Structure formats: structure tokens, C-alpha cells
Design a protein around this ligand. Sequence first.
Ligand code: G6P
Ligand code: G6P
Lengths: 602, 127, 603
Amino acid sequence: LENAVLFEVAWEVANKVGGIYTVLQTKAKVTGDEWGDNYFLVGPYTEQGVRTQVELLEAPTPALKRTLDSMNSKGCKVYFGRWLIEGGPLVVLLDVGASAWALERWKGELWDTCNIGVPWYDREANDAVLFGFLTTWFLGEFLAQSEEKPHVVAHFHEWLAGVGLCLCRARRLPVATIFTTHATLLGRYLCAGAVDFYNNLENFNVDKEAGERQIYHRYCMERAAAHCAHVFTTVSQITAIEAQHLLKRKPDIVTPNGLNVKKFSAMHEFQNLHAQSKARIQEFVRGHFYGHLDFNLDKTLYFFIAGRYEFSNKGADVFLEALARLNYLLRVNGSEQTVVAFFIMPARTNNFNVETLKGQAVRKQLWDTANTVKEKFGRKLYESLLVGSLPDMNKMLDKEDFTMMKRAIFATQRQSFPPVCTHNMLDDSSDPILTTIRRIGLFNSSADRVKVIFHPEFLSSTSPLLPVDYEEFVRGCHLGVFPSYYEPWGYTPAECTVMGIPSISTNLSGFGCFMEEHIADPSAYGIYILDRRFRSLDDSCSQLTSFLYSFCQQSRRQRIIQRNRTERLSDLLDWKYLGRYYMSARHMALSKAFPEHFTYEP
Amino acid sequence: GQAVRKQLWDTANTVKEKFGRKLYESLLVGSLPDMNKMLDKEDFTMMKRAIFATQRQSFPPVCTHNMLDDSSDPILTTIRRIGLFNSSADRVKVIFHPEFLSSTSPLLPVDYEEFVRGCHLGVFPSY
Amino acid sequence: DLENAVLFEVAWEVANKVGGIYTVLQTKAKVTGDEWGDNYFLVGPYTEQGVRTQVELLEAPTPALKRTLDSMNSKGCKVYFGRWLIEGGPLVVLLDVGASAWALERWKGELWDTCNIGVPWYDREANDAVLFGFLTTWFLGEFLAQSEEKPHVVAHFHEWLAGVGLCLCRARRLPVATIFTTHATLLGRYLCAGAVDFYNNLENFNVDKEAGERQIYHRYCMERAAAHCAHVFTTVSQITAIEAQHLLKRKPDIVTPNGLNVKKFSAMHEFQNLHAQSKARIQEFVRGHFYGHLDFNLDKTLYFFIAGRYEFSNKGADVFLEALARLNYLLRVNGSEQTVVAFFIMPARTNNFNVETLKGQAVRKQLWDTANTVKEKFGRKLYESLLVGSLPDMNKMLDKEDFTMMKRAIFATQRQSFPPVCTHNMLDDSSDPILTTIRRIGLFNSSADRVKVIFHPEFLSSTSPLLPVDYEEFVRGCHLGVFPSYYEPWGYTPAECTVMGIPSISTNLSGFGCFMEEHIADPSAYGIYILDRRFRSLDDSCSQLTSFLYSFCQQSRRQRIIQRNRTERLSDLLDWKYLGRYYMSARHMALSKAFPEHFTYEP
Ligand SMILES: O=P(O)(O)OC[C@H]1O[C@H](O)[C@H](O)[C@@H](O)[C@@H]1O
Ligand SMILES: O=P(O)(O)OC[C@H]1O[C@H](O)[C@H](O)[C@@H](O)[C@@H]1O
């Protein structure tokens, strides 16, 4: 309300390291009008990041120029710029060149103030604290040199900026404080290390488990920041439950991350981009299985699962045993429906697999041998239509063309079952996905109604096998199944829902909890939500199959309606809707720190 | 006639691709083409109508362009006199092009140096 | 109702393919093929040309039907019972109109002691209609006689050509319920142009005088009498119902609007996919017809569509031409980038195509030739550059040869003269009502003009040198289909438009426009603009049309798509599924009125 200058503090600002970068990428537009030009982004300085993202500019206000000049003084570095990303974000890039002065003197101060020590072994630990003092310096100077300074909000993202949170309030600078944890630090190691992490979220000895992993300095850094914040904020309501029972600070507001959504001129252009991308997947599955194309591709479905290669976290284990049962239900029942599940999770690869790479080259061979004799037919028809005669149709193709086509069919034929992995792996037997595939019994056989393709790399437009982008490949697949146990927010299930493609999310996922909260209808709107908190592994697998078989039994027309319904939920995941929550958080903090000038509006 | 030639090239490209797509899903399936079902009733009606539009009763023209003085033109006057109206019975068809060949031409898009090389014989009686 | 009853659909257009009634009867077959099942039959004229295409002969299922067919065939009359090959498998009783040996004079003398209507020998179909009339009454008569305890029969009569055989059934007093469905008022057609303000003077028109002045009295008398000798009188349109109330002198009991069997695509947006595909093929035409004069953004261009028989006053081309002349002003005096390319697809007498509409297509092709040459040459130089490992230089991709090729293409694709209005050459160019108006209003397809009028004097065909696309596809390509009319009993040209996703400007005088006013409350909101032409002058109607056209012109890309999706929803209204519920009321209304005890009143 009252004019004020706020700062968004994160490590991922002009770094491009984590997913927090992608959050603040498109957050800049919606926050660029709510506080206007007054808002800033405090971030670390990298010379690599400047050449790409940062364009340096002078200070508009004379107080800011004094603050930047003073920041240059005392062996500290500032590089005020403007981020080249859309929104016009004015960025305050602080270098680690101030390592000589801030780290040694203020580590003792941090000890006399926060009582948190930093091990020298951990690299980003010493780098985070430096960045922490540098932020407090800039905020401190901004409050001091600006006469009658408006209420300040310091918006802190991730553990790396969590240290500078307690310092901004340690110096008692008149500043309202927000901490937005996009992922709980201790929650990541607790997810796999401790069984039933969600079930035992209350039980977990909060100090013991952090110390067993030698991450205590980091948990202590993430906490304290929580306690030394008026408004504590989580992206997910499931992460809010995490913070309530582990970080021990209940999130004041839940501000879910948002995606800028591409608005097309036609509201059905996503469905036009569906058929175009489906055909490019059709060129792949026609090629990968050659001589084994005894399945109707007109009535075939594509299931999609992506993310970092985490077998338990990105819930590949749930989805693999579910397709094994979907193998049964589509085979014991007289069904023509074939499902081609794609596993796009990048891992260590030597090179491309021989038979897959051959299959694509024989695919074009059976396109070349179907273009040569096609042109023969084309000329014979053009010279028959010009004469004035309908093609005989039994003399259009010569004996040579039948020998060409007869040899094309002889080359294509294979006996070996089509491969499961698109690439060749260094550790094939040790690979958790490939080990499960051979266990469940899906070798991409003729009898199998589900054929598993594991592309052990990110997709690229410049690829020998599958030359399509990630964004395009999602739009091609019919359904995007994302079972999860530990996703703070689903950046992959949600990018799916931003597009017209329906996504099977889960209750433990941040996206799935958001869809349960906002909209009342789960399956009706398209987004299937899997109960994984109050259910066993086996029930969760079976619920996936009832969800998968529901989509399998769906008709052509009903699939299109559901894909149109999922398009309507893009507005819900737009920064336009999901940035309202952050705006409330900023307003809520000002009220907590300084009540008289700013109305709380609670 | 030039537009019809491209029309009978377009109607011979549409059903060619329809032949090609049905063949490619026949070669991939593992079966040589049937060769009789390859073209549907939709394709046959396209080709049957294309032929019906092609049909002309007028004999193809002696001069490619339209002249200001057609009757006064010494070449065209001789053609109608000798009796070569580009008929089916005629074994010689005379095709006068009243203007220089060009590559930027709606009809006959070939330049003079290329057009000479295309023709089998270059007859030049002179006085 | 629909229990223990038989319906005979009697029309001249049954297995003939002459008029629009053929399409109505053909399409109605499927919805009527389950309401009365296999029991319904269609009585029609017999043509050996029509049999080879449409009729497959079959034996009689019921033994009584064999008796009826044999007795009529034996008693100096000709019948060819069979099944129509159109969808719904209608069973057709093709009666030979060629068998005129004795009925022509003896039966006409019987017609005069009964109906007191005489037939002139000069009029061909007049003598053929009455023959077909007696033959129907014979078949119905035998069917009632030889079938012991016969279910009540509903004789469903379409057009004046069957209208004579209507009164015979009542004259014999055979137990038969009777329906007459006039798809177009006979006397209304000549009154439309001959008498000024036909709709305004519909009550005033001297009903017997005007019929005699044009020597159609035998047929007006034939169409009337059929009306009076029918329990249920039925009109296709509510505007035709007003016509019949003051011309045929019968208020139509029900209005059963004609319907189209809509093509439903697996995707509910496939019409809009077929929009862009067909728009591009129109874009290829607009790039050709206008060459060297292409200074108009084609992304922001609209296509207006008008079709039908070549009737300048009836199909309301006069209204639409003076309206584009004002739309020329409103899009030019206001700083607008919007260009509108109106297409007039009304077939007329043509000699051949036009030099500059076929040369423009040829230069469009040369500029696709001299682009494809310098693109493959670009492509080959690019392919050998990416393999070496270098991004294309972009100043050295194209050589000096390519610049000379492209520079000469640009020189050839230059014209001083403005693009042609018509896309063919006419026999009577000056006498042509459309072309005369175009030169009068001042739209010569100029650079300054924001509306360019193209009149394709012939029907669209896939096999065409200039514009190779079907009629069905061309409608789907155009943004808006404007159909002003004065006398369209039921507009199928605007009707088929609304079946597709394309919005259509109908009128109050049209049968389709009156239907859209009656059923749905929202006119312009649902897409179908309705023009007031009954209570307004010519000039006001042109201006109402201008405000309707300018409303579509000021519409954005996105708002156009929404309206086209809304017009798709109105296809269900024009489906025989929604429009055949009206014929069912007419049949139900008849069984009851003719035979009250057996069939419920159904009011
Ligand atoms: O994805 P499916 O349910 O197989 O449906 C396939 C359909 O996808 C899109 O909607 C396209 O626009 C249609 O042309 C296609 O028929
Ligand atoms: O017809 P317009 O309003 O110019 O819109 C043009 C649009 O038509 C359809 O909806 C197509 O699917 C779109 O690809 C295209 O953008």
C-alpha cells in the first residue's frame, strides 16, 4: 500500500542452478506491478551469469547510488544490474570477492548472535553466510541512508539465504521478513533414509536426524530463519505439514510456485500441437518396434513420467508395478488398447543402443522404399490421367517395385524382442528402473499390451533418436503419470497441467495437494490424485491401475473433452492466480513487523 | 491447359500420398500392398472427375498468346492454310510462342539457351 | 401414437434428383426409419436413369403387399416396388409415369367430376403429376382394400406434383389420414418479383386473379384443394406459414422445418481444423487472383460467402452489394487494417475462364517456383554448412544468380491494371445483374478499396483450374456467410452454413432466420445475425446489414473463434434429430383428427 522498497533474496538469482531460478523467472512479471519498480532481487554474482542474464545499469534514486557506492567500499562487491528476463527485474548482484572481510569477522558475530557455526569442509556453507552478511549490509545501509525509510520486506528463498534472515533482524533493522522454503532441507534426506517419512513426520527426532547426516549446520540455518521470520511460507500444503512437525514453524501462508502459461490465439492450439507431436512419437514407436508392429497405433496411448533420476522420490517404483497389472487387465480382457509408457529420466549413458538406432534407420528405409515406388506410381498416374484413363491399379507397380517392396519387408523383419532402453547404459544391471522392468516381465513383447521405453536422457530437438523437445513431447503423450513420495512441488506434473495433457498427481506431491484444495472435482477435471499418505505401497499401486484403466477404457471423444478440461486449470497454475498468495505474504509481514502504518487486512 | 496439367499433378500427388501412407503402414506392418484396395472410392472419384475436367472438344491451339493482328500475322495465316490445327490426325503440331521465352513466364518457364538444348533439332531455313 | 399405422411419403423428388425436396426426403429417411420402423414407404415417379443409381429392386415382405403390387400392375397400371439405396433404406413404390395410355384422358375426366380441376395439355409435368396422383390413390386404395382390418394410413404429400393425388384419397373417402408439406409456395415464387412488397401485401393479393395472370391457375388450384383436402397442412417455414395463411388460405397446423444430417467429427473442433486448411486454399487463391497488388495483410483478412441459384432479388445479392459499398467507406474513413474479400458463388452462363485470373494463378506459381529454386539452393548450401560445423553466413547463402532469379520474378509479378472482379468470362457481362451493380457501387478490386469482390460465376469444384476446392470445403474456409434474402422459403444455403462452424447472417423473410428467432432467444450472441426485412425498407435493411458486417469486422481473432464454436452448438437444432420432432407432431396430429377413437388427440 504505502510506497516501499522490497528485496527478493535467493541464491538462484542470476545463477541458474536449481528450480528456484525457474520460480523467480516468471514471478518477476506479476511482482513487477504489485510493487512496481520499487522491488529488487538480491542475488550472488557470477561472471558467467552476467554475460547471459545481467545487464548493468545505474541507480535511479540518489540514496540507492550512495548505498551501492558504500557497498563498493570496505572490501565488499556490488554489481547493480537489470535481469534480461521478462518483467524488468532490477538485480543486486553481490560477489563472493568480499570473502576476505565479511566471512572471518562476522562468523564470530554470527556465533555471538545466532550461535551457529560453519564447517570449513562444506563449500556453499561458507558462501551462504557471506551472502547472508552482504544482504544485511545492503538492507542496513538502505534503512540508514534513506531518511524516513518506508516499511521494508526481505523476501528470503532457500537455506542459502536463510542465514541473512536472522542477521537482518539481529541488527534490529526495521524490516519485515518472509522465508519461502521451496523444499525442506532435512526432508530430502529423511525421505529415503527414514521409512514412512510422511507417517513419522511428527515422531522424527528433529535435532538427532540432522546430526546423523552431518547437515546440522544447515538445518540450524534453515530453522532460526523460520523462527526469525514474522511470515513463514511454504510452496506446498504438504510441505506445510513437513514444516509443522520438523522445522517446527507453521507456515503463515501457502504460496504455491506458479508457471507463466503460454496463451495461444486459438484455445485448441494445444490440441493441434497434440496431433503434430503425437505423429512424431508415432514415427518413433513405428521405428523402435519394426517387424513387431502388430499393434494398432491409431488406438495406442502414451504415458509420460519425467524428472530427476530418483526411483523412490519421483515414484517410478509405483508406476512400474502398476503397468505390470495394467498388462494383465488389458490382456485377460479382450482389448485392442496398447499403451506405450515413456520413462524420460536422465542417467549415465555411454552411447545409443544399437537396435533402437538401427530401428529408426530402417524406419526411414521403409519410408525411402515407400517414396521411390510412390513416385513411380505418381508418374504412372500423372501420365495416365493426362491420357484420359483411370489407373489400371494392377499395372501401376512393376515387377521391380514388388521386388523392392518384397526386400524392404525382408530386411525389416526381426526375431529379437525390441529393446527396453533407448541408450546403452554403463550400469545396466545396477539401474533401478531396468532391474524392475525385467522383474515385472515387460520385455516389449507381442503378447504384452504395455511396452516400456526408457529414454535415459533429457529429450532434445537435436537428437538422433526422438528429435523432439521436452515441451513438445509432453503435448504428444495422452497422459502424464507422476506418482511421487517426496515432491515439495511438482514442477513436472504441473507443467503437464499447464498444457492440455491430464496428469496423475499424488497426495504427497505439492501439486496434488493444491488441486485437492482449490478445485473440488479431482478426476472429473482430469487431474487424478493418488492417496499415498493414508495408504500402503500396494494399495497405492492398485489405485494407480484403477486410474490408468479408467483412462484406457475412455473413448477417443471422452479423451479430448478431458484434455479440454485440463486446459481450464492452467489459469489456476498461472502466476496471475498463484502470485496472489505471495502478495498476501508480503502484506502480512509488513503488518506483523510494523502495524500502525500498514493495515494488516487479516 | 497449363493449370489443368498442375491440377492433374495435384490430384496425382494427393492420392499418391494417400497411396504412400497406406503403403508405409503396409510395409511397416509387414505386408506387400494389395494394389487394388490401395485407392478408395474417394480417390477413384477424384481421379474420375479430374479426367472429366481434362476432356476438351476444341483442338489444342496453334499460338500460345493472343495476338492484336491474328489474321494479318504471316505465320498464323500460313498455318490455317496448310491445315495443321494441332489435330489428333496430324502427326505434326505447330505451337507458335508470339514472344521470347523467359524463365519468369507463366507458361513455358524456360529461357532461350535452355530451350534450344531441349529441342531435338533446330531447323533454320533462310534467305 | 406410432402403433398400428402406415405412412406413405409421396413426392415427385423421390428417386428423381430434380429439386431440393429430394435432399429433404433423403435426409428425413433415417429419423423416420425407426419412428414407424420398416412399415413406412415412399411413393415416387419412376425413371430408368434414377434406378441405376438409387433404386435396388426387392420383393414384398408382407403377402398383402404382393397382392396390392400385383393387382395394380395387372389392371393397366405400372409399379416397381424396391428399396431406395439412400441411408435409412426407405422402401420406394416407384410408379411409372410413362404409363399414360388411358388415365391421361379417362382419369382426368374423372378428376373433373370430383375436383373440377382441368389440366392444360401444353404443360408437361401437369399431365405427369395427375397420372402420378391417380397411381398413388390406386396403391393406397388397394392397400386399404386387400389388407383385412387395415391400420390407419398417413399419406404424407410433398409438393404440388403430388398435391392432386391428395384430394383423390379424400374423394374416394378411403380411410386415410393426410399430410401436405409444401416446401415452397408455388404462387409465392412468381409473386415475389412480379408483385412489389410481396410480404407487405401478402394479405391484399387477389388469390385467384394473380394465379390466372401468369397461367399457373391449374397448379395453384392443384396446390390449394390439396390444402383444403388435408387434415394436417404443413409448411417448412413459419414465414411460409404466413404465406399460406394469406395465399393458400390455410393456417399451417404445424411448422416442420427441413433438416440436414450433420457430419459430426470425433473432435468437436475438427471443423476449426478444417477451417484453417480451407482458409489456406482460399489464401492461395487470393494470392493468385491479386498479384503484384498484394499490399493487404492477409492475416487480418476476412471472407464473406454468398451462394445459391442466380437470383439477384430472391437470394438478396442487391442488399449485400450496396452494404459492402458502405463497408468500403467505414473501413477506409476509419484507420483500419481489416480487408474483406467477399465471394459470390452463384452459377451463371459462362463461355470460359479469364486470361488475368488464370495468369495471376500462374504467376503465383512462378513466385512459388522461383522461391522453391532459391530455397533448395538455400537448403543444399545450408546442409553442407551445418555438416562443416558453421552457422549459415546468411549474406553468402544466396549467390548473385539467385538474386537475379528473384529480381526477375519480382519484375514479372507486376501489373498496373487492378485485379478482375469476376473469375470467368461471361457471355452477357453488361446484362449480368451482379457485375452491373459492382461497377456502379465502385469496387473494382482497387488498392484503396478495403473490400474486394470476387464473383466466381460457376459452382466450386475440386477439379477446377482456378480455385480447386469443393463447395462444402469452401464454406468452412470463409469466416462469415452472409445470406440476405427476400424469398427463401427455407434457406439451405444459410442452413448448411450453420451446420458447419461458420456463422451466417440470415433474414426475417428467410425460413431459417424465422426458425432461429423462434427456437433460440439470443440472435447475434449465438452467431446467427438476423436481418429485419419484413418491417424495414431496402435502405434500412442494407444499413442493418452494414452494422452487422462491421460488428464482425471489428471482432478480434479470439472472439471470432468463440462465435464459431457457438455456431457449432446450433447444428443439433438443425439436425433431423431436433427438426424431425415436428413432422412427428404432424403425423400424430393427423391420425387423431381423421380417426379419433384409435389414436389419442395428442394436443
Ligand atoms: O489423442 P486421441 O484421443 O487419440 O485423439 C486424436 C485427436 O487429437 C486431436 O484432438 C486432433 O486435433 C485430432 O485430429 C485427433 O483426431
Ligand atoms: O479464422 P481466424 O479468426 O483468422 O483465426 C484463425 C485460426 O483458425 C482456427 O481456429 C485454427 O485452428 C487456428 O490455427 C487459426 O489461428
